[PDB]
Amino acid sequence: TAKEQRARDLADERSNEIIRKLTPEQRREALNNGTLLYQDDPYAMEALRVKTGRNAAYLVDDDVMQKIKEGVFRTREEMEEYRHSRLQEGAKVYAEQFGIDPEDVDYQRGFNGDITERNISLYGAHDNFLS
Amino acid sequence: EGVFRTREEMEEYRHSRLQEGAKVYAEQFGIDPEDVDYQRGFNGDITERNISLYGAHDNFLSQQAQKGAIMNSRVELNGVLQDPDMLRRPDSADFFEKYIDNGLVTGAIPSDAQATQLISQAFSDASSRAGGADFLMRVGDKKVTLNGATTTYRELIGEEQWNALMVTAQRSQFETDAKLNEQYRLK
Amino acid sequence: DASSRAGGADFLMRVGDKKVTLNGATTTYRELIGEEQWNALMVTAQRSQFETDAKLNEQYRLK
């Protein structure tokens, strides 16, 4: 509907405004005290958590990509094990950094999105090195 | 350019400049910096821009780490392989072989390409020092595993490349020391 | 530049033993340059005085 689309647009705007300001430490300290911008808007909080998850997912993926390009993993199994372990730990590591429950549905929606495409990209990058 | 040597430094600079530039470009056009439309324009796609900056910085961090690893290896090897008396002992060749193997096993040397660069620069340094011919002659018969193949250090280098390295190591003593050249020529 | 000037050999010989930190590694200026590259730089610095000054070359050769 028009009202829902307007609400989602305003939520995206407010989440962007929160993200620009409020250094991760500031966001974490203002989440506890309740003095967060637009904290009374559930849509804005959902959008903020999804975008945080997306940023965390990119930061986790780029480490594995750089290690693949350096030539660290000499076998595919080694790369897969490292990727799985870092994918498990980075979710939490980037979750409590922003004061977010790592098991939130919105944070996981951001963090897990397009996992197949990212895995395919890593697989191709590693296959070149293996060849 | 390579200004930020750590991710935290880049993040701090980015946050500070992001806070100040909004105002700096707001009063330039006579706009209230807290306007909803100006902020809608200024904050748009902030996540994508942050991701782009993060990737651009990660490339630099990787290349910087590689350079630092190369130089740290050179510094650490000169602790044993710089004295001409240390170079003439077989335990120095054993030390170099074990250093390369241990670095490859424990991940101190993370790549085979980096190990190849370390080996090349170590041999180049040893070719330019007194007693380096003995060290290189002893280490040419020791084993190394790279790219899934186990060779000797003489087989890893070419045969003609090894012969050229040997000639350089043997003859460099008379180019970096005029005393030896004078003594032998006068004799 | 120092390799091409009189007295640059002394300067380079003294500065080769001083420390510098680059790319997260602390080395000496002689270690930052290669060993063979440092030797070539030393030879250039020592011999350039007789190529940029004909007076010195003439004096030494006549002596």
Beta bridge partners of C20: C27
Longest dimension (CA), chain C: 52
Please report the sign of the dihedral spanned by the C-alpha atoms of residue A92, residue A95, residue A97, residue A99.
Answer: negative
Instruction: Tell me if chain B has a CB within 8 Å of the CB of A131.
Output: no
Q: How far apart are the first and last CA of chain C?
A: 30
Separation between Cα atoms, residue B54 and residue A107, nearest integer Å: 20
Count Cα neighbours of B102 within 13 Å in the Cβ-side half-sphere. 7
- Quote the tokens at residue C35: 């060993």
Residue C1: its H or E element: none
Which residues make Cβ contacts (< 8 Å) with residue B111, sequence separation at least 6? A70, A71, A72
Q: Is B28 strand, coil or helix?
A: coil
DSSP string, chain A: -HHHHHHHHHHHHHHHHHHHSS-HHHHHHHHHHT--TTTT-HHHHHHHHHHHHHHHHHHHHHHHHHHHHHT--SSHHHHHHHHHHHHHHHHHHHHTTTT--TT-HHHHHHHHTTHHHHHHHHHHHHHHHH-
Instruction: Tell me if chain B has a CB within 8 Å of the CB of A59.
Output: yes
Instruction: Tell me if chain B has a CB within 8 Å of the CB of A58.
Output: yes
Compute φ and ψ for B106, nearest 5 degrees: -85, 0
Residue A102, classified by CB atoms within 10 Å of its CB into exposed (0-12), middle (13-18) or buried (19+), is: middle
Which residues make Cβ contacts (< 8 Å) with residue B138, sequence separation at least 6? B90, B92, B93
Contact B43 A62 (CB under 8 A): no
- Here the contacts of B150-158 (C-beta below 8 Å, separation 24 or greater) are B153/B119, B156/B119, B157/B123
Count Cα neighbours of A8 within 13 Å in the Cβ-side half-sphere. 6
Q: How far apart are the first and last CA of chain B?
A: 57
Q: Which residue shows structure tokens 């799985």?
A: A84
Q: Report the Cα B23 to chain-centroid distance in Å.
A: 43
Alpha-carbon distance C24 to nearest alpha carbon in chain B (angstroms): 6
Count Cα neighbours of A82 within 13 Å in the Cβ-side half-sphere. 20
* Helix orientation angle between B132-139 and B90-106, rounded to the nearest 10 degrees: 60
Contact B111 A21 (CB under 8 A): no
Beta bridge partners of B145: B150
Contact B148 A16 (CB under 8 A): no
Compute φ and ψ for A88, nearest 5 degrees: -70, -45
| Chain B residues with at least one Cβ partner in A under 8 Å | 15, 18-19, 22, 36, 39-40, 42-47, 50-51, 54-55, 58-59, 61-62, 66, 107, 110-114, 148
Residues in chain A closer than 8 A to B50 (CB atoms): 19, 55
Residue B149, classified by CB atoms within 10 Å of its CB into exposed (0-12), middle (13-18) or buried (19+), is: exposed
Residues in chain B closer than 8 A to A48 (CB atoms): none
Could you say which of B51, B59, B110 has the minimum Cβ distance to residue A72? B110
* Helix orientation angle between A42-70 and A105-112, rounded to the nearest 10 degrees: 30
Q: Check if the beta carbon of residue B115 is closer than 8 Å to that of residue B103.
A: yes
Contact B47 A54 (CB under 8 A): yes
Q: Check if the beta carbon of residue B169 is closer than 8 Å to that of residue B157.
A: no
Separation between Cα atoms, residue A72 and residue C46, nearest integer Å: 45
Separation between Cα atoms, residue A88 and residue A82, nearest integer Å: 10
Beta bridge partners of B146: B149
B141: which DSSP letter?
Answer: T
Q: How was this structure determined?
A: cryo-EM
Please report the sign of the dihedral spanned by the C-alpha atoms of residue C40, residue C41, residue C43, residue C47.
Answer: positive
Beta bridge partners of C22: C25
Q: Check if the beta carbon of residue B103 is closer than 8 Å to that of residue B117.
A: no
Instruction: Tell me if chain B has a CB within 8 Å of the CB of A75.
Output: no
Compute φ and ψ for A100, nearest 5 degrees: -120, 140
Q: Residue A104: name the closest of A91, A117, A115 by CA.
A: A91
With contact defined as 3+ CB pairs under 8 Å, the chains touching B are A, C
Separation between Cα atoms, residue B183 and residue B25, nearest integer Å: 75
Could you say which of A16, A17, A70 has the minimum Cβ distance to residue B110? A70
Contact C23 B176 (CB under 8 A): no
Beta bridge partners of C25: C22
b/e A37-63 (16+ beta carbons within 10 angstroms → b): bbeebebbbbbbbbbbbbbbbbbbbbe
